[PDB]
Design a protein around this nucleic acid. Structure first.
Length: 79
DNA sequence: ATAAGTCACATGGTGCCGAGGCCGCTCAATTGGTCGTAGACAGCTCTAGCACCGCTTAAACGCACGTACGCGCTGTCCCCCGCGTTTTAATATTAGTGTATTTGATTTCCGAAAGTTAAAA
């Protein structure tokens, strides 16, 4: 629906940051696959956090929290 | 001439206006003091260590050597992209409503604490 919004030139630019200088196609659609997996996992964690807080605004507190839970502590925004 | 009197003078004092000078109330967390209990300890004994020999022959290392194997080789297939181009959708602006959070006053909630005792190798 909008995973295509993460588009092939955009992931090309990501891969320029990655240091590549040749990239085939199917790389692209599966980069969308891995991004889907990452987003849904962390989103589920933050969602569970807020809904246990009986709130309905998943919040950066719960996002940095879900990230630390996933094992990677994004860092700079409180936390 | 002088007691009465008017008069102006001279000083009194009373009233109001800032204003710079002390003061009053509160909350931080210190430190003062004090109970009661973790902590280090006080004789201690015995654990599994870790040597300390004293064997054996099971691994193991080299001695040989051999296919397997690698590693660039090499025609060539192929694919990625560097752009060039049209698209194309990503800007990033307002917006009010529609809960989302939210912070008061409770107001029950419930388990830590204090008995009392069940159970327990």
């Amino acid at each position: 629906d909008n995973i295509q919004g993460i588009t092939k030139p955009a992931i090309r630019r990501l891969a320029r940051r990655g240091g590549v200088k040749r990239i085939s196609g199917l790389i692209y659609e599966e980069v969308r696959a891995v991004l889907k997996s990452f987003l849904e996992s962390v989103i589920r964690d933050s969602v569970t956090y807020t809904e246990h807080a009986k709130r309905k605004t998943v919040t950066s507190l719960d996002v940095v929290y879900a990230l630390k839970r996933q094992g990677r502590t994004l860092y700079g925004f409180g936390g």
